[PDB]
Every structure is written in C-alpha cells, then in structure tokens.
Amino acid sequence: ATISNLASDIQSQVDVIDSYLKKHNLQQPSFEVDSPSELPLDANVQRARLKLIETATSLANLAIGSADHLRWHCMNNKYDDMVLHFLARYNIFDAVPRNESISYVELSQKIGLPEHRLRRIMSMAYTRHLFCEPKPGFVAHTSNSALAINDPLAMAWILHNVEEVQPWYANKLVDSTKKWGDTTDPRHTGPNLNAKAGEEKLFYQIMEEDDQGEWNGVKGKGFRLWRLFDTDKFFGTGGAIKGTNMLRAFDWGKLGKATVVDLSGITGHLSSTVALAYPDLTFIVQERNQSWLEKQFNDKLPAELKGSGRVRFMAHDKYAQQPVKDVDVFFMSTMLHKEPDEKAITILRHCAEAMDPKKSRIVTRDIVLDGGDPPAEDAVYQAGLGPTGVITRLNAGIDLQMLAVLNAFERTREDWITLFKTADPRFVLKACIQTVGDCASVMEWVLEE
Amino acid sequence: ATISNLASDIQSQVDVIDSYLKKHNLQQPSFEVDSPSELPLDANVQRARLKLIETATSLANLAIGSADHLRWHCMNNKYDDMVLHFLARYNIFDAVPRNESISYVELSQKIGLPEHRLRRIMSMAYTRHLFCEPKPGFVAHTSNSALAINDPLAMAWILHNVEEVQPWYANKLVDSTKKWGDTTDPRHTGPNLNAKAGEEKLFYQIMEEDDQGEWNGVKGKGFRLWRLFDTDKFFGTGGAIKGTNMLRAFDWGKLGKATVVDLSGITGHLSSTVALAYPDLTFIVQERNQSWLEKQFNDKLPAELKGSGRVRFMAHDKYAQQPVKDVDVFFMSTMLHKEPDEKAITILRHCAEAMDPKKSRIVTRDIVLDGGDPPAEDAVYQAGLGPTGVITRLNAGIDLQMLAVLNAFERTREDWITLFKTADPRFVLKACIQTVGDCASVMEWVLEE
C-alpha cells in the first residue's frame, strides 16, 4: 500500500457508488439528520462500499503512521466507548431535539449533567460524527446520532457492552486465559476468577437472576436479560444483519403452509418478519422461560400478528426432547454459535429425532467465517473478507464476544458441515447463502438416506 | 459531506504529500516493517497529513453509514484494546521476529498461548494493520507492530491504559459523576465510589504504594509509577509530542550558560534532549522522590551526560518553596495540566518568588485547546483543529484522561493567561508556539513591572 494507490482505489470505489446513486435517483449519504442510513443492497454497490470502508480506514491508518499508532490509539479509543456510556445514561440522544439545535446550557439543565463535563464529553463525540456543534455554544444531531433517538434497542447495545461485556469479561480475558487455559466452559470467565468452589456464576445466570435494576419495561429480576434481548432485536431491525436479509437468502414461500419451530428464541422477532411476509407459516418460538417473557413477547408482536397464533411463544429447554409434532422447519438464527460442539450436537439430535426426512429441514443462520455463497443473481477474497476486510473484522468482534462472555466460538463452513454430520451422518448442506453486506449466512440442512 | 467531495479532498491532500516526498527523494510510507514511521515535519505536509487522516476517517464513517455505526462500534472497538492487552502481556511483538514470518504453531509455543486463542486474537489485530498473515498459517510484523519491538515504553502505554485507566477510572466515570458531581478533587474518582471515610485512595498514591508486581527493572513498591514514568517517556521519544519539537518552538540557545529548574519531573528525559543540544545549560530535575528514582534517573541518562552534572535529579515537593538560587528558567512540560487552579497557583507563586524578573522566565509546555501559533517560518480552523480534527481528538483524549484519573483538565490560551496573571499579575505571555503535528504548545512567561 501507498497513499497514492489507496487514494486511487478510493476514487474507483466512490465512482461505483456515486454512479449508481445518480443513475437511480437515490439520496446521497451525508452527516445530516435525514441522510439515508444505508446504501443500496445491490451487490456491486455493497462490494464497493465494503472495499471503500477498508481502503479509507487503511489510508487513515497509514497517514497516522506507525509512530502515532499506539500513542493515539491507547489514548483515544477507549473514550469513544466512555462517551457512548454518558450519552446513553444521560439520555442525550433524546434530549437533543431531532431537527433543532440546543444550547449546552439548556442541554446540561435538561439532563442534569454539569455543563463543563457535558462539553468535554461532546467534544469527543463530535470526532466520530456523533452529534455536532453547528454554532458555538450549541449542539445538534448528525445522521449517526439521530438514528438512535427513541431507540431503546440501540441504548441496550451501548449499555450491555460498556457496563457488562467490557468490564466483567473482556478486560479479564488475559487473566481467565492464565487461570484456566483455552476451554469451552462458560464458567471459565472473568466473574469467576476468584470464585469459591461451586459458586461460579454463568453470564446467562447473572442475566436472568439479577433483580437490582430495571430496563425498558422489565423491573427487577432479569432486567439485564431483557436488555440483552433488546440487543438481539437491534441487530435484526437494521444494518448489516437485518432480519429481512433472510428473505433474500432462503425461499420461505417454497414451504407453503408449514409449521416452523423457531429455536432462535429471544422474542421471535425474526419469525415475526417472516410471518408478515408469508401468512401460511406458523412459528412456534422456543426459549427458556422467564416470568415476564410471555407478556413481553406478546406485547412486542406486530399488531397484525397479535392474537393470530401465527407467531407464538412456547417455553422450552433447547437441550430437551422436542414436543412439537409434524414440524416442517427447525429454524435457528445466531443460536448455535453460542454452543460448543457437544451442546450443539444435543440440540441438533433432538431436532433430527423430530424430523420426517422426506418433509423436514433445518434452516440455520450464523457466521460462516470463510464466507457463504452469494445469492444466485449476485454470483483473493470476496469483498469484505481478507485480513483487513470489514466483515472479517465484524466476524472477529462477534467471535471475541463469544470467547469473552461464553468461551463459545464462530465456525467455518467445514466446521458447520462436520458438526451436523456428527450429530446425524444423514445431514447434507443444501445451500449456504450470504448476502453482500451481511456477516451471516442462511444454511439449509436436510436428512438424506 | 458527500462521498464524492471527501474523495476529492483526499486526492488533493495525497497529492500535496506525494509530491513533496517525490521532490525530496523521501521514502513512501507503507505497512512494511521498514516503512518510515512518520511523514516530514514540513508544515504544509503535516497540514495535509492531519487533513487526510480526518477526511479518510470521515469517508469510512460515511460509508459505514448510520445504521451500522453503533452496531459495529460497540461490537468491535473495545476488542482493539483487548487485542493489545494480549499482545503486550504475551510479548507477541518480541516473539514475532522483525524480518521473518513465524507459524502460529511456533508462535503459540514460544509465548505459551494456546494456538486456537492466539489465532482469534491475531485475526482482530490484523484489521488495524498490526501484524499480518503473509501466507496461511504464518504471522509477520507490519510497520505499526515492528516499531514496538523491544520497546517497554510502548508496552507501558498499552498496559497502563488497559489495566489501570480503563477499568479503574474511565469505566466508572458515570458513577463518579453521579456520586460527587463535577469537582476537581482527585479523590472523587472511581476507586473511591464505596470507600469508607478517610480511606480514599488517590491515583498517584496507588501508583507509588502498590508493591505487588514488577515493571522494567523496578520490582515491588512503586512498579506502577515506574511504568507510568515509562509512558511519559514514550510520548517524548517519537510521534506527535516528541520532545525534539521543543527545539523548534523555543530558542534554548538564547539563554547562553544558564540554570534550568525542570519541574516536569518524571526522569528528566526532556531536559536530557535539550542538554544534549545545548552543553552550556544545567538542568535540575525536580520530582517527588521514590526509593528507586535517583538510581533509575541516573541509569537512563544518555551516556554522554552520565556523571557530568548537566542533568541531575533533585527530590522536591512542587508545592513547597524553591531551594535553587539564581534560576534562569523554570521549565515545566505537561505538568500544570494535572493541577487545578489553586494547586497550579501555589506552584507558580513558588517559582515567581524565586525569579529575578530581569533575568528569569518560565517555559511551559502544555495543550492549548484553541491552538498555539505556528513557528514564524510556518505562518475556519487550523489543520487538525475543528470538531473532527485529529488534534482536537487527541486533545480530547488527553483531557478525558485527566478528567477520569484526576478530575484535572486541559486549558485554552486565555485560561492559561488568566491562571498565570492570578498567580502573579506581573506575568506576561511572550510566545505560545505549537508545531504543526503536535498537540502541545511551548509558552514563554516573564514578569513585567
């Protein structure tokens, strides 16, 4: 890489994107409040986007240079997260009006954060194009910050990372590695470094048991788990992993009238997206129960689905035998990646024992670390992959989140195939489709004699 | 901003830099091990560099877009720091040979980190151009990582941030703000959120007292403070704030044969740089004593200065009267920014009482948040400043480090002038010079009747 060749590559990638936007009369992205929040899903546009992010980031890295690389990174980067911590806990997104500016004096008063400290936090926020200072003394939104107005799912994602993942797990991972080595046991995690025998706490136990707090309509026991469920929904409502991508990566219409057991769990928000598009499907969403789960699940269903039975909650232990009969599809999105091989095999064997091989299939959605195949219309590394690819990087972030919190791990295509064949040697991978811009693939599995 | 106008601005900035490199037969930066570690200090080149970093980063931010902004940031960013934590604690920089590749198998064995976990850490490192995978199965250095080989100062900066600043202070700043409000008291910091009365610990008390560890030649009591002193030296040896910039921002030769009391403290590494350049100066470096400080100070002096008396340590309480007579210069680099107004005024009055107004001056070096004046040859915002400027961002990182650890703060030019005039109304700011590429200014103060 040289600064000149990176600049030339940037111009080529920009020209692909800009030409497509102009040809199709599409809005140009900006940092204004009402900028589009994404670029078109056209595969060639998304390839250019993924390459542009990588090449622009590489050029900034090269221009910073090696002398300022660690000097600046270890100074600044952790404060981007601390700034978000303040913005979420003081509800600054909602306190700044969407379409107007607000003085620091008025903003400070609205949120109860002394103005001199507010000013020092906002100064750092602006450097990530998160809010802006349109005139001296005043604060306004940007594209990036306005999209989080009135969005508890986005606030959940900030706070889960800054108040739980980073302090309890990531910042203890070196010590956990030294204490237990490289294991897949979710007890071998930061909260347990000094735990007395038999008193180890699992992440999911802390999530479901802590009662000292409230989040987004759940007060007391399990508020942190409810907030975690909100983070899962955040990844479905928009952005790279949005749930509507599944409609492009798998043909739900080919199932006709069919029963889907959705072992993705959580609140069934992906089942709801598919159900709205395909009224002949019934989704039975299976998840470990919590006192508030059935009520919250039902309250969050799209209005059109409430009371219809098309998407319904069924409390279930995913490690136990399957009670639903005549299931056409076992569906599980971003669920098996939390399961080391033996636990994943238990789940998959309970599904297989409940499958009619001639009629049933398993549809999974997970990272394939090497890459899924693009959708047929869209057919050294694919854009976004390779050592500096932005999808390589997102996959690594998710993989390290699985490591830090659970000792779980992401898998390659061959890893998935081997896992399923160990569960039942009759499993065949029929399709592994990843839309350009997304890190997950939708995989279709059948039992063949 | 649009993607096209950012791309055009990138091409203009690259052309300035590339034309200068070619005209002067200078090496092109790359990610290779032996890339230059910085660009020329020519002011127009550095202005173009600072603008290029900002514009490239803005273009990557825009191409990511608002939908993936928080989704990706809160996933990935904290892992850049966790990766550094591993790289430093397992000494991966030194274990990868500078000029050769090493297999993951051999690297894992050298450092005692299981290979599967090593591979998952390196995957994330590569996305910041920190090491690379030149062939499948093998690891090599990049420009960015090779510069940290055999550099305990760089390792100190990683570990101080990831093991002390972030967990003990930054990740508790919201809670500290809620407990105490906006104060300048260094007791009102994260370690003391639950401290019992009169048992509060100051950062600098923890640094100097903890004896459960070792760092870079200091075993036991005060190892963390020694590591902090190494971080201070790291900012002097290279990069934006390198100490040789002071030779451009102030004329030490005009002093002739002169005595300088250096209240920067630490290990006098900036005094050593000036002393090597100006043999007629004597520097008396004043700092709070520690058992190991005089020995380490003397061992780290440049060979040419050892035993010469040109740079010597004098234990001193900066809040106490000044014992040295006939001082020509009181020098203090990045020291007063840790001092709230009343404490800074105490120091400055002790200096002023020891000054002959006709002969003496104070030379300070600190951030001026609005910007110092460029050196005379180099004469809405200056490059690097403004809301997304990279020097604005570094200043904010340092300002938030001062907030989180000490409740201290950075200052504008007018803040500095007001502070000095409160200390003694005879103080006049004669010069405030900031070299392009650096965040600190060198300020010259005299007493005028």
XYZ file of N, CA, C and O in Angstrom, chain B residues 11-21 42 44-45 48:
60
model
N -7.848 13.173 -2.528
C -6.888 13.213 -3.618
C -6.024 14.463 -3.527
O -4.809 14.384 -3.733
N -6.608 15.594 -3.157
C -5.832 16.832 -3.037
C -4.779 16.729 -1.935
O -3.616 17.122 -2.135
N -5.150 16.171 -0.776
C -4.223 16.039 0.343
C -3.113 15.042 0.035
O -1.931 15.318 0.272
N -3.477 13.915 -0.584
C -2.483 12.946 -1.007
C -1.536 13.584 -2.005
O -0.318 13.325 -1.978
N -2.054 14.405 -2.903
C -1.155 14.954 -3.914
C -0.129 15.870 -3.261
O 1.036 15.894 -3.681
N -0.518 16.685 -2.275
C 0.462 17.506 -1.559
C 1.566 16.635 -0.970
O 2.762 16.917 -1.126
N 1.186 15.561 -0.260
C 2.160 14.727 0.436
C 3.027 13.999 -0.569
O 4.266 14.040 -0.475
N 2.403 13.321 -1.534
C 3.146 12.541 -2.528
C 4.091 13.406 -3.352
O 5.243 13.002 -3.610
N 3.666 14.609 -3.725
C 4.547 15.483 -4.494
C 5.765 15.862 -3.678
O 6.879 15.938 -4.221
N 5.583 16.175 -2.388
C 6.711 16.525 -1.555
C 7.659 15.341 -1.375
O 8.887 15.505 -1.483
N 7.129 14.147 -1.121
C 8.002 13.002 -0.957
C 8.834 12.778 -2.211
O 10.043 12.522 -2.126
N 7.753 19.240 7.635
C 7.348 20.408 6.853
C 5.892 20.748 7.143
O 5.025 19.863 7.098
N 3.449 22.351 5.643
C 2.417 22.092 4.651
C 2.155 20.594 4.487
O 0.993 20.177 4.310
N 3.196 19.763 4.607
C 2.998 18.320 4.582
C 2.196 17.885 5.799
O 1.265 17.068 5.672
N -1.463 18.787 5.451
C -2.100 17.846 4.549
C -2.311 16.500 5.232
O -3.366 15.872 5.056
